[PDB]
């Protein structure tokens, strides 16, 4: 457990924190906007996961300024996490 494992390990933990907080903040931001569908927590968590994994079906998405702002954080933290693990497994193989 040097640096190339603690980084990916913390990123995975941080990601889960972002997913939980992101789904919570999304509901807070999306409510008050007529037509918004991202207004309940259980499906907001499902949205955050498919957002952080860059899947993004289209069944759920933010339509507000702060809602979309929260979404961007979920994307970046998502790509970084899934990208930091990739760079982690790369360094592992290089050192044999």
């Amino acid at each position: 457990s040097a640096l190339h494992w603690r980084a990916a390990g913390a990123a995975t933990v941080l990601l889960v924190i972002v997913l939980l907080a992101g789904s919570y903040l999304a509901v807070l931001a999306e409510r008050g906007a007529p037509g918004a569908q991202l207004i309940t927590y259980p499906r907001a968590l499902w949205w955050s996961v498919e957002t952080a994994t860059t899947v993004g079906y289209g069944d759920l998405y933010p339509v507000t300024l702060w809602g979309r702002l929260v979404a961007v954080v979920v994307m970046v933290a998502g790509i970084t996490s899934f990208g930091l693990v990739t760079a982690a497994l790369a360094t592992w193989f290089v050192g044999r």
């Epitope: 919570y24 509901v27 807070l28 999306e30 409510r31 008050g32 569908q37 207004i39 309940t40 927590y41």
Partner: antibody
Framework: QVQLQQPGAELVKPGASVKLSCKAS????????IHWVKQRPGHGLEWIGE????????NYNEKIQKKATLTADKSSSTAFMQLSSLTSEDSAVYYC???????????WGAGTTVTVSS | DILLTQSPAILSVSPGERVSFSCRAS??????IHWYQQRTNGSPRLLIK???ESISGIPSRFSGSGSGTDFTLSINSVESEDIANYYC?????????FGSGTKLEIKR
Amino acid sequence: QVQLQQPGAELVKPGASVKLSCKASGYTFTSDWIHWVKQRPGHGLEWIGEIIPSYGRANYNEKIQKKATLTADKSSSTAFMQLSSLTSEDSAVYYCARERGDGYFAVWGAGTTVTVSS
Amino acid sequence: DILLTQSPAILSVSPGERVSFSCRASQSIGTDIHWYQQRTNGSPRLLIKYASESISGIPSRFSGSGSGTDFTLSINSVESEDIANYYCQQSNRWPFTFGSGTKLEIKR
């Protein structure tokens, strides 16, 4: 036990104001939403607004006249609805309901019969 | 805003007979509909959540069905304690909206 305690009635003069309360009991999570529903006699249920005590943000029904201002108190776990400048059209039973942030209203209050008269 | 229409407004039925209430949305809301009950001088009581999912405490007679725009609340063999107003409420899009309500009437 009763999870939402509301005052029995509140007499208001035309043009004055009143502050209804909604004391909560039982499990009070941080993801709880407190809603307020207006019901005139002979009519149906009418959504007024919502508020999450944790953050303090409140939303209101834009389809009707903005006359209610939702506030909360995390200390005593009670929700408040400030009705301003009431007329004869505002005389109704005002319920309060707890939502777990999953859509439905699990528990309703007994309702506060607000009467606007001189 | 999503409009919720309940037809008819009044529903007459003989005792021990199956009855069905109707709730139609102006647009597709999936299964995000909820049924409530309100007797005379009483507060609304959650009967069914999410179209068909039952609530603990509510008798077995109360069932739920429907998806998209059309939804139905059913009572298997209606008895006298079911005399009340039945409302439907959606939670698919903000803001939440209620139905016009349907009053159950038993002809004895």
